[PDB]
Amino acid sequence: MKYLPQQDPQVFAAIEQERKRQHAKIELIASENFVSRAVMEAQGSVLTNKYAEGYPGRRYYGGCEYVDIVEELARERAKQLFGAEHANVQPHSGAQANMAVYFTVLEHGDTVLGMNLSHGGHLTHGSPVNFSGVQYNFVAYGVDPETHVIDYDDVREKARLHRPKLIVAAAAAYPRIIDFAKFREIADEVGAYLMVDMAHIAGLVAAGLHPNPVPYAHFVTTTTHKTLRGPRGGMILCQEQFAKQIDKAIFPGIQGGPLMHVIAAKAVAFGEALQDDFKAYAKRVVDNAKRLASALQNEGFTLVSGGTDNHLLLVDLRPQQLTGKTAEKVLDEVGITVNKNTIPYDPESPFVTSGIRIGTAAVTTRGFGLEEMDEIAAIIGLVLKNVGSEQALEEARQRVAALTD
Amino acid sequence: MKYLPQQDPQVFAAIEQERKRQHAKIELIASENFVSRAVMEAQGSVLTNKYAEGYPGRRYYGGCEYVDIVEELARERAKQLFGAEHANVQPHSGAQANMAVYFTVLEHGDTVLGMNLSHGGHLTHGSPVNFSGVQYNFVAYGVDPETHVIDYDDVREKARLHRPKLIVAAAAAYPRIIDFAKFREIADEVGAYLMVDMAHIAGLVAAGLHPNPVPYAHFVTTTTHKTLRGPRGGMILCQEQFAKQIDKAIFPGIQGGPLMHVIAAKAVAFGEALQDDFKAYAKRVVDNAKRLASALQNEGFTLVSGGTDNHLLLVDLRPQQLTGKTAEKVLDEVGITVNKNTIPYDPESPFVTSGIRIGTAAVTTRGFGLEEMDEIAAIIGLVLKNVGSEQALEEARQRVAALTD
């Protein structure tokens, strides 16, 4: 940076603290990643100056010739990446991507079937304090109490009983592969649309390490900033038959002017994802998650679903008689960033929880491999089995420092 | 830029075209501006990597210590700038800022009173193809057919007849000062909340050149990217009594993770607005708008409301027997960027229009003064009075080139 240090000492100092923090800590928040310097440069571009309501070649402002190229690059790369017939790269976020799909196919008060929020579902999948649960009538399907795998017979019964206009598949905290074929089969039985929110697993889908929801879902939503390793924002994929309606839902429906600089960064991120090395990266994410899962089990930890098929895992802390909140706090003390997370059939409230959610996307980006996973698990073991020992926590603190250089 | 040119030739080339376009053209889109290099650097920062759901000191992720400082700097500077008791700097856009306020005080189907969209009102103020008009029952007040000034007796009658739960004041294309005192007086008579959407005039409010809606409105919404000259995004101001409800409406209500890098840029933009030179800048914007208005009248053009009190003006093209669409297209040919815009009581559809909307914020930022305004008006005169003459258009093209260097 050059001009920010001179113009705003306060803001520059705070950003510099954040930059250094991102390097010093072991980042295990499952939804986080590190973007390339190219993605950031695109976001820091003059494209923020341009009003571009509408779509490429069909704008409501003049002078959009070059931002049109940028948006088309984003749309076409996404389509190549996911095999979709249409992309909308304007959603400001995952929330807005989901909001737009709901706005497209649902009327106020329509019934929607989504994943139980305490079993893995996201806030935008029917939380009573979120627009989704306030605007629409959300019912929920659950996971099996033993296996923690989605109970597809429950999905089917809930759909047949409540007759939703829309079924939502996908999760903020589900460690196993989702069967989109079964979701579509159930959707077809009850005459419901199928929406897949692939936000968490999008990078893995692109690399072919998770089944692609595109051929099965009427609508696929995602964030660009999780496993996809792009800028903060949203995206909608769908077939040509919904293309016009989806575009209208985003604008003039729920948004105004798109963030053209962020869309530029989306294009960059998609360009990177199309490369061979991103496929290798994404495999390492999954391999690292499996390794970390195995190594945590070796430490004596119980994992939700008994392991993982993807980038993320959940530790059931009940055997150690710890809350997710306690675990989160103490790991923060040694430089390991996790978040407390509800486990399926959690006896605790979502503000306390019996678990922690861990992901490998961020650490894999910085170059962590299987050996690092073994060590991360060993540190977590040392910390959580010795919460009252300041010497154990200091040892953990030093071992975290050794890993991050 | 360094890494984007190597990583993505296609995206870099398109951005570079846009950068050069922004310099070459005379930018008169009323909602546009040019941000500082400091604002852009903040947006191009590593802060995009951080999930920060919730608010400073009350986050739902660990490691937010430094993004908390950034957000607080943004909130406190905004409060200093506008004299507000509370700020929410998380809205992704003006659309989302408005959406959150509607979500706070209204139920589905509630009556809202807003400015007639063909008289100056924005899409988010009750368009039937926008969430606002679909989710809520919007009624409209108008401007006087002669003066084009808001008819406050009409605002009062519409409020008394339809009994709205909320009154919205402010506009996307209104060239005169809005009387927020009268809006509040009417709001109090019918027991309605008052929302002011100051998006367009926010920079002028901050510099003291337009009356401040804050002391009069329960809620003030704005974009950060118009006269305020900040990054693309939204903001909500309100009194302490609505602070908690407004924060809840943004999250977990209508959004998810905030754009911390954009919030950093918002703080930078507010820092700049607090400086003496921004006040001088904003006065030049208004002075330039008055000068341009006067010079256009000198060319023989009729202006909506007979002039301007702010940054923007509207040309009624009916005397020249031109549509806004025709005027927009031909000015595009010579390098002058305007947008077609409905005039009050327009005989044409919003896709054709009888007017063009012009603003001075962008050209004032690049250093244009009164003499430049005289020349811009003279060029517009040459073009619109000689639409069929390619030699007149070539002369105009050269004169535009002379202005932009």
CA-to-CA distance for A380 and A368, rounded, in angstroms?
Answer: 16
Return the residue of A nearest to B74 by Cα. Answer: A11
Whose CA is closest to B42, among A16, A151, A305? A16
Same domain, yes or no: B248 and B308:
no
CA-to-CA distance for B134 and B116, rounded, in angstroms?
Answer: 16
Whose CA is closest to B231, among B222, B239, B240, B220? B222
Is A299 considered catalytic here?
Answer: no
From B221, B253, B283, the end of a domain falls on B283
Same domain, yes or no: B332 and B254:
no
CA-to-CA distance for A218 and A229, rounded, in angstroms?
Answer: 24
Of A226, A229, A290, A291, the active-site residue reads A226
Residue in B129, B131, B252 nearest the CB of A123: B252
Neighbours of A282 (CB within 10 A): 25
Give how far Cα A310 sits from Cα of A172, A314, A394, B85, B218, Å: 12, 11, 32, 46, 47
Among B2, B6, B8, B32, most A C-beta atoms within 10 A, so best to mutate, is B8
CA-to-CA distance for A20 and B382, rounded, in angstroms?
Answer: 57
Residue in A19, A49, A73 nearest the CB of B32: A49
In Å, the largest CA–CA distance within chain B is: 65
> Is B73's CB within 8 Å of A10's CB?
yes
Cα dihedral B302/B307/B308/B314 (nearest 10): 0
> Is A259's CB within 8 Å of B232's CB?
yes
For A166, the token pair is 């829309």
For B305, the token pair is 């409301």
Give how far Cα B196 sits from Cα of A36, B220, B222, B223, Å: 40, 5, 8, 12
Burial class (CB in 10 A: 0-12, 13-18, 19+), B161: exposed
Whose CA is closest to B40, among A47, A70, A65, A69? A47
Range of the domain at A212: 33-283
Per DSSP, A253 falls in state I
> Is A49's CB within 8 Å of B33's CB?
yes
Among B232, B247, B259, B261, most A C-beta atoms within 10 A, so best to mutate, is B232
- Collect all residues with Cβ–Cβ distance below 8 Å to A188 and sequence separation of at least 6: none
Is A223 considered catalytic here?
Answer: yes
> Is A11's CB within 8 Å of B271's CB?
yes
Active-site amino acid positions of B: 51, 53, 197, 223, 226, 232
Residue in A37, A129, A232 nearest the CB of B3: A37
CA-to-CA distance for A389 and A386, rounded, in angstroms?
Answer: 5
Return the residue of A nearest to B4 by Cα. Answer: A38
Per DSSP, A190 falls in state H
> Is A15's CB within 8 Å of B42's CB?
yes
Way the structure was solved: X-ray
Burial class (CB in 10 A: 0-12, 13-18, 19+), A72: middle
Among A46, A221, A251, most B C-beta atoms within 10 A, so best to mutate, is A46
Cα dihedral B331/B333/B334/B339 (nearest 10): 30
Give how far Cα B289 sits from Cα of B53, B292, B307, Å: 41, 5, 9
For B56, the token pair is 């400073």
From A250, A283, A316, the end of a domain falls on A283
CATH number (domain holding residue A83)? 3.40.640.10
Query: Bridge partners of B236?
Result: B88, B221
Give how far Cα B32 sits from Cα of A5, B40, B230, Å: 26, 15, 10
**How many Cα atoms occupy the beta-carbon half-sphere of B171 within 13 Å?**
33
> Is B63's CB within 8 Å of A92's CB?
no
Chain centroid, CA B73 distance in Å: 23
Give how far Cα A20 sits from Cα of A229, A270, A345, Å: 20, 27, 38
CA-to-CA distance for A194 and A158, rounded, in angstroms?
Answer: 14
Whose CA is closest to B197, among B134, B289, B121? B121
Q: How far is B299 from chain A (nearest CA, A)?
A: 24
SS3 letters across chain B: CCHHHHHCHHHHHHHHHHHHHHHHCEECCCCCCCCCHHHHHHHCCHHHHCCCCEECCEECCCCCHHHHHHHHHHHHHHHHHHCCCEEECCCCCHHHHHHHHHHHHCCCCCEEEEECCCCCCCHHHCCCCCHHHHHCEEEEECECCCCCCECHHHHHHHHHHHCCCEEEECCCCCCCCCCHHHHHHHHHHHCCEEEEECCCCHHHHHCCCCCCCCCCCCEEEEECCCCCCCCCCEEEEECHHHHHHHHHHHHHHHCCCCCHHHHHHHHHHHHHHCCHHHHHHHHHHHHHHHHHHHHHHHCCCEEHHHCCCCCEEEEECHHHCCCHHHHHHHHHHHCEECEEECCCCCCCCCCCCCEEEEECHHHHHCCCCHHHHHHHHHHHHHHHCCCCCHHHHHHHHHHHHHHHC
For B31, the token pair is 């909602």
Contact call for residues B116 and B342 (beta carbons, < 8 A): no
CA-to-CA distance for A378 and B226, rounded, in angstroms?
Answer: 52
DSSP per-residue codes, A47-82: GGG----EETTEESSS--HHHHHHHHHHHHHHHHHH
Query: Bridge partners of B302?
Result: B316
Single-letter amino acid code for the residue at B118: S
Contact call for residues B355 and B324 (beta carbons, < 8 A): yes
**How many Cα atoms occupy the beta-carbon half-sphere of B345 within 13 Å?**
12
Is A16 considered catalytic here?
Answer: no
Contacts of B338 in chain A (CB under 8 A): 62
Q: Which position has the token pair 């960027």? A: B337
For B293, the token pair is 């208005």
Single-letter amino acid code for the residue at A162: H
Contact call for residues A273 and A365 (beta carbons, < 8 A): no
Same domain, yes or no: B219 and B324:
no
From B239, B258, B283, the end of a domain falls on B283
CA-to-CA distance for A317 and A320, rounded, in angstroms?
Answer: 5
Contacts of A252 in chain B (CB under 8 A): 123, 127, 129-130
Of A53, A185, A287, A375, the active-site residue reads A53
CA-based end-to-end distance of chain A: 23
Q: Which position has the token pair 């921004």? A: B278
Same domain, yes or no: A55 and A202:
yes
Residue A122 three-state SS? coil
> Is B4's CB within 8 Å of A42's CB?
yes
For A362, the token pair is 């961020």
Contacts of B1 in chain A (CB under 8 A): 41, 45
Same domain, yes or no: A88 and A134:
yes
Q: What resolution does the deposited structure have, in angstroms?
A: 2.0
Contact call for residues A282 and A258 (beta carbons, < 8 A): no
CA-to-CA distance for B7 and A267, rounded, in angstroms?
Answer: 11
CA-to-CA distance for A310 and A285, rounded, in angstroms?
Answer: 8
CA-to-CA distance for A192 and B37, rounded, in angstroms?
Answer: 49
Contact call for residues A370 and A61 (beta carbons, < 8 A): no
Residue in A18, A39, A271 nearest the CB of B47: A18
**H or E segment to which residue A120 belongs:** none
**H or E segment to which residue A274 belongs:** none
> Is A264's CB within 8 Å of B15's CB?
yes
Residue in B225, B257, B271 nearest the CB of A232: B257
Give the A:B interface size as CB pairs under 8 Å: 279
For A345, the token pair is 């059939």
**How many Cα atoms occupy the beta-carbon half-sphere of A214 within 13 Å?**
23
List phi, psi (to 5°) of B153: -70, -30
Residue A139 three-state SS? strand
Same domain, yes or no: A246 and A298:
no
Residue in A31, A32, A41 nearest the CB of B1: A41
> Is A49's CB within 8 Å of B60's CB?
no
Cα dihedral A283/A289/A295/A299 (nearest 10): 180
**H or E segment to which residue A337 belongs:** strand A336-337
Residue A184 three-state SS? helix
> Is A253's CB within 8 Å of B40's CB?
no
Give how far Cα B365 sits from Cα of B226, B278, B283, B297, B334, Å: 12, 10, 11, 24, 21
CA-based end-to-end distance of chain B: 23
Same domain, yes or no: B162 and B84:
yes
Same domain, yes or no: A346 and A231:
no
CA-to-CA distance for A174 and B332, rounded, in angstroms?
Answer: 52
Same domain, yes or no: B245 and B303:
no
Contact call for residues B110 and B162 (beta carbons, < 8 A): no
**How many Cα atoms occupy the beta-carbon half-sphere of A267 within 13 Å?**
30
Contacts of A248 in chain B (CB under 8 A): 129
Angle at A358 between CA A352 and CA A363, to 5 degrees: 145
β-strand pairing of B355-359 with B339-341: antiparallel
Is A232 considered catalytic here?
Answer: yes
> Is B66's CB within 8 Å of A21's CB?
yes
Q: How far is A224 from chain B (nearest CA, A)?
A: 11
Whose CA is closest to B33, among B209, B173, B232? B232
CA-to-CA distance for B175 and B359, rounded, in angstroms?
Answer: 10
Same domain, yes or no: B24 and B43:
no
Residue in B65, B69, B255 nearest the CB of A95: B255
Contacts of A108 in chain B (CB under 8 A): 108, 135
Residue A338 three-state SS? coil
> Is A256's CB within 8 Å of B93's CB?
yes
Domain count, chain B: 2
- Collect all residues with Cβ–Cβ distance below 8 Å to A91 and sequence separation of at least 6: A97, A100, A221, A233, A234, A235, A236, A250, A255
Return the residue of A nearest to B227 by Cα. Answer: A49
Tell me how long chain B is.
405
Angle at B394 between CA B390 and CA B399, to 5 degrees: 145
Same domain, yes or no: A253 and A341:
no
Chain centroid, CA B24 distance in Å: 23
Neighbours of A347 (CB within 10 A): 9
**H or E segment to which residue A388 belongs:** none
- b (16+ CB within 10 A) / e for B313-329: bbbbbeebebbbbbbbe
For A349, the token pair is 């409230």
CATH number (domain holding residue B388)? 3.90.1150.10
Same domain, yes or no: A110 and A224:
yes
**H or E segment to which residue A30 belongs:** none
CA-to-CA distance for B271 and B264, rounded, in angstroms?
Answer: 11
Residue A203 three-state SS? helix
List phi, psi (to 5°) of A147: -90, -20
List phi, psi (to 5°) of A173: -150, 60
Return the residue of B nearest to A338 by Cα. Answer: B62
- Collect all residues with Cβ–Cβ distance below 8 Å to B97 and sequence separation of at least 6: B91, B221, B222, B223, B234, B235, B236
For B252, the token pair is 């977990």
Cis amide leading into A252 (omega within 30): yes
